Design a protein around this motif. Structure first.
Motif, PDB file in Angstrom:
ATOM      1  N   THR A   1     -22.842 -33.975 -17.270  1.00 25.41           N
ATOM      2  CA  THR A   1     -23.879 -33.601 -18.220  1.00 25.41           C
ATOM      3  C   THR A   1     -24.445 -34.834 -18.903  1.00 25.41           C
ATOM      4  O   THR A   1     -23.701 -35.674 -19.404  1.00 25.41           O
ATOM      5  CB  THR A   1     -23.335 -32.639 -19.296  1.00 25.41           C
ATOM      6  N   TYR A   2     -25.767 -34.942 -18.910  1.00 25.19           N
ATOM      7  CA  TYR A   2     -26.422 -36.065 -19.540  1.00 25.19           C
ATOM      8  C   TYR A   2     -27.065 -35.563 -20.825  1.00 25.19           C
ATOM      9  O   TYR A   2     -28.168 -35.009 -20.806  1.00 25.19           O
ATOM     10  CB  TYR A   2     -27.478 -36.653 -18.604  1.00 25.19           C
TER      11      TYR A   2
ATOM     12  N   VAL B   1     -29.153 -32.451 -19.473  1.00 22.22           N
ATOM     13  CA  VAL B   1     -29.303 -32.229 -18.043  1.00 22.22           C
ATOM     14  C   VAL B   1     -27.919 -32.043 -17.422  1.00 22.22           C
ATOM     15  O   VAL B   1     -27.031 -32.879 -17.605  1.00 22.22           O
ATOM     16  CB  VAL B   1     -29.992 -33.432 -17.345  1.00 22.22           C
ATOM     17  N   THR B   2     -27.738 -30.946 -16.697  1.00 22.27           N
ATOM     18  CA  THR B   2     -26.463 -30.671 -16.047  1.00 22.27           C
ATOM     19  C   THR B   2     -26.553 -31.009 -14.564  1.00 22.27           C
ATOM     20  O   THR B   2     -27.310 -30.384 -13.822  1.00 22.27           O
ATOM     21  CB  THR B   2     -26.065 -29.188 -16.193  1.00 22.27           C
TER      22      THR B   2
ATOM     23  N   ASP C   1     -30.220 -43.357 -15.595  1.00 17.63           N
ATOM     24  CA  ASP C   1     -30.920 -43.516 -16.861  1.00 17.63           C
ATOM     25  C   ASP C   1     -32.282 -42.847 -16.708  1.00 17.63           C
ATOM     26  O   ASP C   1     -32.615 -42.348 -15.636  1.00 17.63           O
ATOM     27  CB  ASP C   1     -31.085 -44.995 -17.244  1.00 17.63           C
ATOM     28  N   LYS C   2     -33.058 -42.822 -17.782  1.00 19.60           N
ATOM     29  CA  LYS C   2     -34.375 -42.201 -17.745  1.00 19.60           C
ATOM     30  C   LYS C   2     -35.201 -42.647 -16.537  1.00 19.60           C
ATOM     31  O   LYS C   2     -35.726 -41.817 -15.797  1.00 19.60           O
ATOM     32  CB  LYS C   2     -35.134 -42.519 -19.039  1.00 19.60           C
ATOM     33  N   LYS C   3     -35.304 -43.955 -16.326  1.00 19.35           N
ATOM     34  CA  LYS C   3     -36.096 -44.466 -15.213  1.00 19.35           C
ATOM     35  C   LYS C   3     -35.598 -44.055 -13.828  1.00 19.35           C
ATOM     36  O   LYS C   3     -36.384 -43.608 -12.994  1.00 19.35           O
ATOM     37  CB  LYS C   3     -36.209 -45.991 -15.301  1.00 19.35           C
ATOM     38  N   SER C   4     -34.301 -44.190 -13.572  1.00 17.81           N
ATOM     39  CA  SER C   4     -33.787 -43.817 -12.260  1.00 17.81           C
ATOM     40  C   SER C   4     -33.854 -42.309 -12.034  1.00 17.81           C
ATOM     41  O   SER C   4     -34.228 -41.855 -10.954  1.00 17.81           O
ATOM     42  CB  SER C   4     -32.349 -44.325 -12.075  1.00 17.81           C
TER      43      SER C   4
ATOM     44  N   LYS D   1     -35.340 -37.041  -9.350  1.00 15.13           N
ATOM     45  CA  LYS D   1     -36.629 -36.384  -9.158  1.00 15.13           C
ATOM     46  C   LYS D   1     -37.290 -36.498  -7.782  1.00 15.13           C
ATOM     47  O   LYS D   1     -37.740 -35.497  -7.219  1.00 15.13           O
ATOM     48  CB  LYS D   1     -37.599 -36.870 -10.241  1.00 15.13           C
ATOM     49  N   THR D   2     -37.361 -37.707  -7.244  1.00 13.27           N
ATOM     50  CA  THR D   2     -37.990 -37.899  -5.942  1.00 13.27           C
ATOM     51  C   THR D   2     -37.464 -36.952  -4.863  1.00 13.27           C
ATOM     52  O   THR D   2     -38.243 -36.354  -4.131  1.00 13.27           O
ATOM     53  CB  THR D   2     -37.833 -39.348  -5.453  1.00 13.27           C
ATOM     54  N   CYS D   3     -36.148 -36.807  -4.749  1.00 10.60           N
ATOM     55  CA  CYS D   3     -35.615 -35.906  -3.734  1.00 10.60           C
ATOM     56  C   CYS D   3     -36.023 -34.456  -3.974  1.00 10.60           C
ATOM     57  O   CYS D   3     -36.278 -33.710  -3.026  1.00 10.60           O
ATOM     58  CB  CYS D   3     -34.090 -35.980  -3.681  1.00 10.60           C
ATOM     59  N   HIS D   4     -36.070 -34.052  -5.241  1.00 11.99           N
ATOM     60  CA  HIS D   4     -36.439 -32.685  -5.590  1.00 11.99           C
ATOM     61  C   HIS D   4     -37.834 -32.289  -5.106  1.00 11.99           C
ATOM     62  O   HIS D   4     -38.117 -31.114  -4.909  1.00 11.99           O
ATOM     63  CB  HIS D   4     -36.337 -32.480  -7.106  1.00 11.99           C
TER      64      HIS D   4
END
Ligand code: HEC
Ligand code: HEC
Ligand code: HEC
Length: 68
Positions: free
Chosen positions: A5-6, A13-14, A40-43, A50-53
């Motif tokens: 969990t972040y 975010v889980t 982190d936020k950027k990655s 995100k990119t994979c999603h």
């Protein structure tokens, strides 16, 4: 761990590490011997998450990851 969990301002975010592994397999995200991946936020908003999603039912909308 199996679940990560972040905690953050925009909404926690889980990351269900086990579920992702079961569907994709280790090398989908890990190169060589599986090791910790700095998130982190950027990655997260890019290649680490995100990119994979963008290719699946994975969440790309803010609320899909950030809950409350
Ligand atoms: C992308 C969706 C991943 C898949 C598929 C697998 N792993 Fe993973 N792993 C990923 C991230 C983003 C992280 C960092 C989590 C965090 O702490 O913020 C990790 C971390 C690991 C680690 C590091 C050591 C630890 O403390 O857990 C290991 C040893 C690890 N991952 C192993 C591993 C294996 C063997 C997988 C297949 C069953 C696997 N991961 C899939 C992202 C992703
Ligand atoms: C592909 C290489 C992925 C990476 C990198 C990350 N995610 Fe993912 N995520 C992926 C898939 C295939 C799915 C869809 C599940 C399905 O069967 O439709 C998901 C889903 C999520 C979800 C949604 C809810 C859930 O089912 O768990 C979340 C909240 C999620 N993913 C978070 C997340 C995070 C934070 C990542 C980086 C640490 C991450 N995902 C990477 C594929 C991939
Ligand atoms: C899952 C793939 C995500 C999507 C889609 C979006 N965000 Fe995100 N964001 C995600 C993670 C895992 C993290 C890292 C948290 C950490 O531990 O550092 C973030 C972080 C942010 C932050 C920073 C919060 C802070 O307290 O500094 C912000 C401001 C943020 N995210 C905004 C945001 C918005 C508005 C989004 C839609 C464009 C969005 N995120 C999507 C994972 C994911």
């Amino acid at each position: 761990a199996d679940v990560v969990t972040y905690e953050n301002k925009k909404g926690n975010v889980t990351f269900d590490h086990k579920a992702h592994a079961e569907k994709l397999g280790c090398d989908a995200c890990h190169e060589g011997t599986p090791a910790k991946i700095a998130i982190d936020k950027k990655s997260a908003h890019k290649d680490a998450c995100k990119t994979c999603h963008k290719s699946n039912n994975g969440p790309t909308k803010c609320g899909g990851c950030h809950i409350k």
